[PDB]
A paper describes a structure:
Broadly neutralizing antibodies are proposed as therapeutic and prophylactic agents against [name]‐1, but their potency and breadth are less than optimal. This study describes the immunization of a llama with the prefusion‐stabilized [name]‐1 envelope ([name]) trimer, [name] DS‐[name], and the identification and improvement of potent neutralizing nanobodies recognizing the [name]‐binding site (CD4bs) of vulnerability. We have previously designed an [name]‐1 [name] trimer [name] DS‐[name], a highly desirable antigen that is conformationally fixed in a prefusion‐closed state, in which neutralizing epitopes are almost exclusively exposed and non‐neutralizing or poorly neutralizing epitopes are hidden, even in the presence of [name]. [name]‐1 broadly neutralizing antibodies (bNAbs) target vulnerable epitopes on the envelope ([name]) trimer, such as the [name]‐binding site (CD4bs), V2‐apex, V3‐glycan, and fusion peptide (FP). Cryo‐EM structures of these nanobodies in complex with [name] trimer revealed the two nanobodies to neutralize [name]‐1 by mimicking the recognition of the [name] receptor.
To elucidate the mechanism by which the potent and broad llama nanobodies recognized the [name] trimer, we determined the structures of [name] and G36 in complex with [name] DS‐[name] by cryo‐EM. The cryo‐EM reconstruction map of [name] in complex with [name] DS‐[name] was obtained at 3.6 Å nominal resolution from 315969 particles. The refined structural model revealed the binding of three copies of [name], each to a protomer of the [name] trimer, at the CD4bs. The epitope of [name] covered 715 Å2 on one protomer with a minor interaction of 21 Å2 with a neighboring protomer. Indeed, [name], G36, and J3, as well as the domain 1 of [name], are all bound at a similar location in the canyon between two gp120 subunits. The approach angles of [name] and G36 were different. This and their different sequences resulted in differences in paratope‐epitope interactions between the two nanobody‐[name] trimer complexes. Overall, [name] and G36 bound at the CD4bs, in the canyon between two gp120 subunits with quaternary interactions, mimicking [name] binding. The broadest neutralizing nanobody D188_G36 (21/25, hereafter referred to as G36) and the most potent neutralizing nanobody D271_[name] (geometric mean IC50: 0.101 µg mL−1, hereafter referred to as [name]) were selected for further characterization. The triplicate format (nanobody x3‐IgG2a) resulted in more potency improvement for [name] than for G36, which is likely due to their different binding pattern and approaching angles to the CD4bs.
Numbering used by the authors:
A (entry chain F): 519 to 547, 568 to 664
B (entry chain A): 31 to 141, 150 to 186, 188 to 309, 312 to 321, 321A, 322 to 398, 411 to 505
C (entry chain J): 1 to 52, 55 to 82, 82A, 82B, 82C, 83 to 100, 100A, 100B, ...
D (entry chain B): 518 to 547, 568 to 664
E (entry chain E): 466 to 505
F (entry chain E): 272 to 309, 312 to 321
G (entry chain E): 128 to 141, 150 to 183
Write the structure that this text describes.
């Protein structure tokens, strides 16, 4: 089969099948080659923990595909559906939406909080 | 039932053999009123007030004494703690001017004829301009003749230079515990009849090791840990003439001795801030240091050792002991340490007997050396400063490092001679019932589940 | 591999000198120290020299015999002078303990075969 | 009770599946010598624990201790009775028996989890 | 046009072996629209 | 032919060949190094 | 302060000058005596 980053040239539709390959190895593994190397082994775990906490608070923690509330706003991108998932690559998608990935991270948190409060009060009532 | 499905279990009791880095655990003993130690335990963390051991069962785990990584992990920590504690004090290079030494004849005894020498030389004072004439007493083991009141020279300003030991610190051993990090376990064998490369069907787990003193000696272990029942014989492979026989005693044998000579250290200045503590004026008679052992104890401990040893070499054999037959000066003589002064006693009155199949005390003469070269290397030494008064030491002979001679085809004349070598058999006699295991928790097992969607 | 290969044997006029040498390899001549044997007919085994590692000292049993080394070359030179009528034996070079433990009495492992040295006019 | 680290390491598999908490609670306990020596292990332990947790999370798992899964037994890895496995051997013996069939299992589990994820995602669409 | 040899900074002997290379930081997280709704 | 901006007079013009051009050279002498003593342990090796 | 003279041992006109005999005093391993050693130094490592 393919390998690391092997589908980075593939289309978006077929890219959502090798998510495990590019997610399994984010945690791989005095004098020079001493503390300089030791910096990286701490930075990597810090970045991974931050990414997991972000995939946390929103409400997911199952990794991979985890689809959710906060419906799409057409102002971000007025495009079709098959236009996005069959004739594009993830790099182009990032280039198209790079400045708008700052308000979504705030909407998801409050949506998760509302869902949690609804569930908690519904359970505690009865 | 008819359907078998995998299942992932987390945290099951499964371990493998691996290696890692262990750390300190030393008893606090307040430690505020301390005079420092070369084996600095201030960096070490406080220990558990009460270690807890969990007794396992149904488990038989194989051990090994001669392929253990704990020993090789310890030998690079004593050395590293030694080099670190000799850096921040005086580094006297200007001590090897042409010494103009002579003899000493101040009420000496014929046993100590020669030996001590009256050396006299020139030093640079604190100012970089003037010179002073000083004198000292130097043992015959620290000066060599040159240009053969003949001029002498320190034996060391020919290959290296050495830093006088920091005078505040002391060489007193203190118990140390070695504890493994999280994710590892310390298995300990509790069988009383352990023999080296053999499984222990009683192995338990312990938080970490018991207190083990980093003592240094040769051909006679001191202040060691005894064993139950009878004396024990351990070896790598006891059919060869090039493998040690680490005997372990049962009843301790007491040895004790002193240096019956008053000594008054005198301090001189060689530069800005640095000082040099040289000896001068021995107040009293001159006698040699000697160590006493009790004959009534050795006379039976050797018998018990030979009775246990006759197991592997047949029953009708004449076991014979002998003294060391030559080698370096650290292997052929007892080389213990006593209160900052390094003795080199001459053990030839003990290994003297012949054993057939069918109050008085022993005194061992000694000599004192100051230019020591422990942790045998090329390019270092340490001038051990003189100390005042008379020192006495009482010590516990729990061990022996005999080695065989053999080789003369098949016969019955087995001779044993003491012998050292690498200073790694003084720690393979305290870290033999231990091993370190890495726990691997994740596991797979079949069961009758489906994970209904 | 460790086995030792020796050379330099011959016949000597009483009152001469030799240059006995032996060379070996085997990726393990860093832990060991190499000395020499002496076996004459009718007598037991003795020792003649042992170049101890960890000290560089050149221990010997007689004043004449001296052991020596040169650089990192895996060859050892045993220099002998003023030989007498008693120095007629079989000379072998073997490996001793790391600090030249008991020799003139031990029987080591990883030993050589041995050259022949005879003295006569 | 029979608490303590590795307390039931000699007990049978039937009663061993009760102290999984004890053997997993302390997996993350916490320039001279005793300096960088501690710091060289306090990072390795964290990395090992994180790797184990990520491996558990990749499959359909991370509830925690006991986790059900698809991909049935191939019946060639061990021709043993179920009561034979679960009431007569210890975990060490089981590891010795299956030390060297696991590599393909570690991929089977993840491919099954991916298939289940895709099934859920495309089932949640038509409704 | 005349050409003369000339060195300078000791950095053109390593810009001749590390020229067809680059290092990239992989950022995994992503957001895309699709046809779901998290059902409670 | 590679360059930062090849129209200037202050930018190197790196050239990468296709076939190697073998170059030989040797020093036609025997120096013998003698060793003298500086102090305790240290040595200085000087041509002689 | 080196005391240096020329070299005239089977020299070649292409290598005229260049090498120089250089004698100087050096401290021995003892902090008391002084040696008297010599060396050969190239013309690129000594200045007048
Ligand atoms: C084996 O263990 C024994 C028992 O600890 C060691 O003997 C002890 O040696 C120390 C160091 O010389 C003695 O400490 C000294 O005590 C005197 C008198 O209190 C004091 O004036 C000194 O300043 C110093 O603190 C200690 O007294 C002595 N123990 C006994 C019972 O006399 C022995 O040294 C150990 N073996 C080796 C090789 O170190
Ligand atoms: C060792 O040598 C020193 C000096 O060489 C001796 O000290 C001398 O002692 C006599 C009296 O016995 C004095 O008159 C001298 O002035 C001393 N010399 C100096 C330089 O002060 C010392 O006696 C000798 N013996 C011993 C045991 O120290
Ligand atoms: C223990 O030491 C003895 C030494 O005699 C070993 O026996 C020798 O083994 C080598 C290599 O197999 C043979 O070349 C010798 O001929 C053997 N000597 C004798 C007298 O038989 C023995 O192998 C060692 N034990 C282990 C487990 O290695
Ligand atoms: C080691 O030192 C101890 C203590 O100084 C000696 O033990 C004492 O020996 C005398 C002998 O006259 C007895 O009267 C004492 O009763 C002993 N002390 C104790 C506490 O029993 C011992 O003799 C020394 N070692 C040797 C070999 O003599
Ligand atoms: C071992 O013991 C023997 C004899 O008990 C010692 O041999 C003596 O050594 C001295 C020192 O050179 C000689 O003067 C004697 O002539 C030797 N005697 C004999 C009979 O050979 C030997 O020195 C002892 N070894 C050690 C290391 O102490
Ligand atoms: C070590 O002790 C032995 C045992 O006494 C010493 O051997 C004696 O040394 C004296 C010293 O001249 C000789 O006269 C004797 O002939 C030796 N043998 C015996 C049996 O007494 C030995 O000299 C001591 N020192 C060393 C370095 O071995
Ligand atoms: C490459 O180098 C040339 C130099 O010849 C640059 O052109 C000069 O640019 C500066 C600043 O814009 C002007 O002041 C000069 O007048 C220009 N020179 C000429 C001859 O027109 C050119 O900009 C450089 N290329 C890049 C991409 O910076
Ligand atoms: C470089 O080339 C020159 C000339 O080809 C070589 O000089 C020759 O050296 C040989 C060997 O000593 C002489 O027999 C010739 O007479 C020399 N030719 C001359 C001086 O024109 C020189 O050896 C070469 N250097 C190398 C190959 O390192
Ligand atoms: C460099 O200096 C040395 C020493 O000054 C010269 O060696 C001398 O050579 C002459 C004969 O050529 C001898 O008589 C002297 O005894 C030598 N000196 C010593 C100290 O032994 C040498 O000639 C000079 N030149 C070169 C090229 O080495
Ligand atoms: C690359 O582009 C070609 C042309 O559109 C396409 O057929 C192919 O699927 C793409 N991906 C890969 C991995 O080749
Ligand atoms: C001085 O001691 C040496 C020890 O080496 C001895 O040889 C010499 O005879 C002694 N001389 C006197 C006068 O005591
Ligand atoms: C010490 O220096 C003085 C200086 O006058 C000198 O006379 C004396 O010989 C020196 N001592 C030695 C070299 O032992
Ligand atoms: C000085 O050290 C060397 C070893 O480097 C040794 O051979 C020699 O005997 C020592 N003593 C001297 C040169 O006086
Ligand atoms: C220890 O005992 C076992 C028991 O079989 C034996 O195989 C082994 O050789 C012994 N090791 C020794 C005596 O060093
Ligand atoms: C050792 O014993 C001898 C005689 O037995 C005695 O003279 C000496 O004082 C003793 N020394 C010690 C330190 O016990
Ligand atoms: C040693 O000297 C000190 C100080 O002069 C003295 O108090 C002590 O009694 C002396 N020791 C002996 C055994 O005379
Ligand atoms: C003490 O040594 C003698 C001499 O070998 C021996 O005969 C005797 O049996 C020994 N004592 C004991 C109790 O064995
Ligand atoms: C032991 O030493 C004594 C003298 O100390 C001596 O008489 C005896 O012969 C020695 N033992 C042997 C076996 O030679
Ligand atoms: C030496 O052994 C005796 C007898 O067991 C013991 O009482 C003493 O404490 C030991 N010495 C030590 C441990 O320093
Ligand atoms: C140990 O073995 C015995 C004997 O079969 C068994 O009864 C027991 O359950 C096992 N486990 C423990 C913890 O004793
Ligand atoms: C696992 O054990 C060895 C190690 O690779 C292997 O040869 C063997 O085939 C495996 N076990 C089985 C039952 O196949
Ligand atoms: C490299 O080639 C590109 C091709 O468009 C060109 O624009 C650029 O100037 C070139 N760089 C050089 C020649 O340094
Ligand atoms: C140069 O010097 C060495 C050193 O003795 C000598 O053996 C050699 O033959 C000389 N000539 C050459 C061409 O190496
Ligand atoms: C020595 O060499 C120098 C180098 O420039 C030169 O000037 C001088 O004339 C030479 N003298 C002799 C005597 O060779
Ligand atoms: C070396 O020292 C001696 C001392 O006698 C002196 O005569 C000579 O000129 C010195 N050499 C120099 C300074 O080159």
């Amino acid at each position: 089969f393919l390998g690391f980053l092997g589908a980075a040239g593939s289309t978006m539709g077929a890219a959502s099948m090798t998510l495990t390959v590019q997610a399994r190895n984010l945690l791989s593994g005095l004098t020079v080659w001493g503390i300089k190397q030791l910096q990286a082994r701490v930075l990597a775990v810090e970045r991974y923990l931050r990414d997991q906490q972000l995939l946390g608070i929103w409400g997911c923690s199952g990794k991979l595909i985890c689809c959710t509330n906060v419906p799409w706003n057409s102002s971000w991108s007025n495009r079709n559906l098959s236009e996005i998932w069959d004739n594009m690559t993830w790099l182009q998608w990032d280039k198209e939406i790079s400045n708008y990935t700052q308000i979504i991270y705030g909407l998801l948190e409050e949506s998760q909080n509302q869902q949690e409060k609804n569930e908690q009060d519904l359970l505690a009532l009865d | 039932a008819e359907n078998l499905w995998v299942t992932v279990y987390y945290g099951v009791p499964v371990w493998k053999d691996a290696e890692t880095t262990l750390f300190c655990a030393s008893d606090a003993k307040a430690y505020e009123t301390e005079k420092h130690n070369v084996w600095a335990t201030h960096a070490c963390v406080p220990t558990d007030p009460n270690p807890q051991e969990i007794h396992l069962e149904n488990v038989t785990e194989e051990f090994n004494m001669w392929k253990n990584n704990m020993v090789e992990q310890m030998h690079t920590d004593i050395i590293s703690l030694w080099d670190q504690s000799l850096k921040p004090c005086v580094k006297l290079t200007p001590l090897c001017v042409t010494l103009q030494c002579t003899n000493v004849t101040n009420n000496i005894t014929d046993d100590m004829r020669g030996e001590l020498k009256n050396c006299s030389f020139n030093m640079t004072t604190e100012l970089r301009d003037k010179k002073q004439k000083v004198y000292s007493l130097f043992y015959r083991l620290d000066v060599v003749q040159i240009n053969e009141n003949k001029e002498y020279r320190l034996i060391n300003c020919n290959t290296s230079a050495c830093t006088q030991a920091c005078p505040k610190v002391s060489f007193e051993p203190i118990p140390i515990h070695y504890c493994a990090p999280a994710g590892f376990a310390i298995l300990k064998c509790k069988d009383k009849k352990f023999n080296g490369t053999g499984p222990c069907p009683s192995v338990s787990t312990v938080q970490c090791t018991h207190g083990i003193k980093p003592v240094v000696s040769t051909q006679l272990l001191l202040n060691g840990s005894l064993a139950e029942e009878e004396v024990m014989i351990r070896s790598e492979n006891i059919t060869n003439n090039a493998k040690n026989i680490l005997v372990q005693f049962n009843t301790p044998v007491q040895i004790n001795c002193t240096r019956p000579n008053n000594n008054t250290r005198k301090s001189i200045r060689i530069g800005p801030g640095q000082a040099f503590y040289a000896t001068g004026d021995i107040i009293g008679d001159i006698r040699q240091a000697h160590c006493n052992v009790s004959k009534a104890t050795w006379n039976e401990t050797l018998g018990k050792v030979v009775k246990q040893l006759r197991k592997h070499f047949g029953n009708n054999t004449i076991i014979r002991f002998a003294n060391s037959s030559g080698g370096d000066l650290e292997v052929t003589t007892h080389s213990f340490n006593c209160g900052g002064e390094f003795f080199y006693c001459n053990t030839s009155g003990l290994f003297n007997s012949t054993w057939i199949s069918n109050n008085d005390s022993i005194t061992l003469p000694c000599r004192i050396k100051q230019i020591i070269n422990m942790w045998q290397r090329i390019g270092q030494c340490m001038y051990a400063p003189p100390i005042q008064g008379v020192i006495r030491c009482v010590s516990n002979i729990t061990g022996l490092i005999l080695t065989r001679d053999g080789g003369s085809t098949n016969s019955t004349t087995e001779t044993f001679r003491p012998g050292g070598g690498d200073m790694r058999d003084n720690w393979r006699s305290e870290l033999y019932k231990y091993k370190v295991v890495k726990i691997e928790p994740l596991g797979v097992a079949p069961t009758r589940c489906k994970r209904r969607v | 591999q460790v086995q030792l290969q020796e050379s330099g044997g011959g016949l000597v006029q009483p009152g001469g000198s030799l240059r006995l040498s032996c060379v070996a390899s085997g990726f393990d001549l860093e832990n060991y120290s190499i000395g020499w044997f002496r076996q004459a007919p009718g007598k037991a085994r003795e020792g003649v020299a042992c170049l101890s590692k960890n000290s560089g000292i050149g221990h010997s049993v007689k004043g004449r015999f001296t052991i020596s080394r040169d650089g990192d070359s895996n060859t050892w030179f045993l220099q002998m002078g003023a030989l007498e009528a008693e120095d007629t034996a079989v000379y072998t070079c073997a490996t001793y303990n790391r600090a030249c433990a008991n020799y003139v009495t031990i029987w080591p492992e990883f030993r050589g075969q041995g050259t022949q040295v005879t003295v006569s006019s």
